[PDB]
Design an enzyme around this catalytic site. Structure first.
Site, mmCIF file in Angstrom:
data_model
loop_
_atom_site.group_PDB
_atom_site.id
_atom_site.type_symbol
_atom_site.label_atom_id
_atom_site.label_comp_id
_atom_site.label_asym_id
_atom_site.label_seq_id
_atom_site.Cartn_x
_atom_site.Cartn_y
_atom_site.Cartn_z
ATOM 1 N N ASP A 15 45.888 19.475 170.401
ATOM 2 C CA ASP A 15 45.264 19.832 169.687
ATOM 3 C C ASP A 15 45.699 21.577 169.744
ATOM 4 O OD1 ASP A 15 43.910 20.815 171.907
ATOM 5 O OD2 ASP A 15 42.031 19.790 171.196
ATOM 6 N N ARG A 29 44.648 26.882 167.810
ATOM 7 C CA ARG A 29 43.998 25.788 168.275
ATOM 8 C C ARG A 29 43.427 25.080 166.968
ATOM 9 N NH1 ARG A 29 40.627 21.979 169.015
ATOM 10 N NH2 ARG A 29 39.509 21.522 170.761
ATOM 11 N N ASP A 34 38.678 17.627 168.511
ATOM 12 C CA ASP A 34 39.047 17.470 170.217
ATOM 13 C C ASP A 34 39.952 16.373 170.418
ATOM 14 O OD1 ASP A 34 38.904 18.599 172.824
ATOM 15 O OD2 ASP A 34 37.095 17.464 173.218
ATOM 16 N N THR A 35 41.235 16.717 171.020
ATOM 17 C CA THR A 35 41.915 15.723 171.740
ATOM 18 C C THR A 35 41.684 15.388 173.080
ATOM 19 O OG1 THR A 35 43.814 17.267 171.635
ATOM 20 C CG2 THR A 35 43.982 15.799 169.777
ATOM 21 N N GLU A 37 42.654 15.802 177.182
ATOM 22 C CA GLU A 37 43.707 16.566 177.567
ATOM 23 C C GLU A 37 44.748 15.703 178.227
ATOM 24 O OE1 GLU A 37 43.344 19.903 177.896
ATOM 25 O OE2 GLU A 37 41.272 19.726 176.967
ATOM 26 N N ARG A 75 43.306 32.605 170.793
ATOM 27 C CA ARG A 75 43.916 31.444 169.984
ATOM 28 C C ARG A 75 43.707 31.569 168.589
ATOM 29 N NH1 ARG A 75 42.264 26.166 173.387
ATOM 30 N NH2 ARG A 75 40.551 26.869 172.513
HETATM 31 C C1 LIG Z 1 37.906 24.407 168.215
HETATM 32 C C2 LIG Z 1 37.217 25.750 168.621
HETATM 33 C C3 LIG Z 1 37.286 25.927 169.859
HETATM 34 N N1 LIG Z 1 36.849 27.039 170.739
HETATM 35 C C4 LIG Z 1 36.314 27.068 172.058
HETATM 36 C C5 LIG Z 1 35.028 26.225 172.537
HETATM 37 C C6 LIG Z 1 35.340 26.035 173.688
HETATM 38 O O1 LIG Z 1 35.080 26.869 174.835
HETATM 39 P P1 LIG Z 1 34.869 26.667 176.293
HETATM 40 O O2 LIG Z 1 36.628 26.927 176.788
HETATM 41 O O3 LIG Z 1 34.085 27.583 176.989
HETATM 42 O O4 LIG Z 1 34.608 25.385 176.674
HETATM 43 C C7 LIG Z 1 36.915 25.989 173.770
HETATM 44 C C8 LIG Z 1 37.383 24.432 173.650
HETATM 45 O O5 LIG Z 1 38.731 24.432 173.458
HETATM 46 P P2 LIG Z 1 39.576 23.430 173.973
HETATM 47 O O6 LIG Z 1 39.229 22.115 173.623
HETATM 48 O O7 LIG Z 1 41.261 23.778 173.786
HETATM 49 O O8 LIG Z 1 39.341 23.477 175.754
HETATM 50 O O9 LIG Z 1 37.251 26.621 172.805
HETATM 51 C C9 LIG Z 1 36.026 27.839 169.675
HETATM 52 O O10 LIG Z 1 35.414 28.973 170.117
HETATM 53 N N2 LIG Z 1 35.896 27.769 168.390
HETATM 54 C C10 LIG Z 1 36.791 26.563 167.661
HETATM 55 O O11 LIG Z 1 36.667 26.483 166.707
HETATM 56 CA CA LIG Z 2 40.870 19.530 173.916
#
Ligand SMILES: Cc1cn([C@H]2C[C@H](OP(=O)(O)O)[C@@H](COP(=O)(O)O)O2)c(=O)[nH]c1=O
Ligand SMILES: [Ca+2]
Length: 129
Positions: A15, A29, A34-35, A37, A75
């Protein structure tokens, strides 16, 4: 919403992908998914699926939603298309991502993606097996 040009710099995982957008490198992103890890079950399969799509395409595109265009890590947040096919939807339809992180105001494609997920779950694909 509208599709904008980008070029692949490098696939990262299921993702996230690094693209050149308006001539600048950015990590994107994928919205609404959510994929797993890379170190988790289906993680390598999700990474390989996203990589193949974005590498094999003639044309990759970015489509921002109506809300925030970047997250707290810098991102980009977008729907990514590979020769017109949405990566975000395709991952969900294959059972390689769950619909997730649905924030109000960047959720235009939510119901399209939830329909894909129901289909993947009925078919017991991958994460739903
Ligand atoms: C997809 C997405 C993720 N994020 C943030 C929330 C999550 O915060 P936290 O890092 O504090 O958990 C993180 C999840 O991304 P990843 O799934 O890439 O780890 O990215 C957003 O803020 N907006 C979005 O639309
Ligand atoms: Ca992920």
């Amino acid at each position: 919403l509208h599709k904008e040009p980008a070029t692949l710099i490098k696939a990262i995982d299921g993702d996230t992908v690094k693209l050149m957008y308006k001539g600048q490198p950015m990590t994107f992103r994928l919205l609404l998914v959510d994929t797993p890890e890379f170190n988790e079950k289906y993680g390598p399969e999700a990474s390989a699926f996203t990589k193949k799509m974005v590498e094999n395409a003639k044309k990759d595109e970015v489509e921002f939603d109506k809300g925030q265009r970047t997250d707290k890590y810098g991102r980009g947040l977008a729907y990514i298309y590979a020769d017109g096919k949405m990566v975000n939807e395709a991952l969900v339809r294959q059972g390689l991502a769950k619909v997730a992180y649905v924030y109000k105001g960047n959720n235009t494609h939510e119901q399209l993606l939830r329909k894909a997920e129901a289909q993947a779950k009925k078919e017991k694909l991958n994460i739903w097996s």
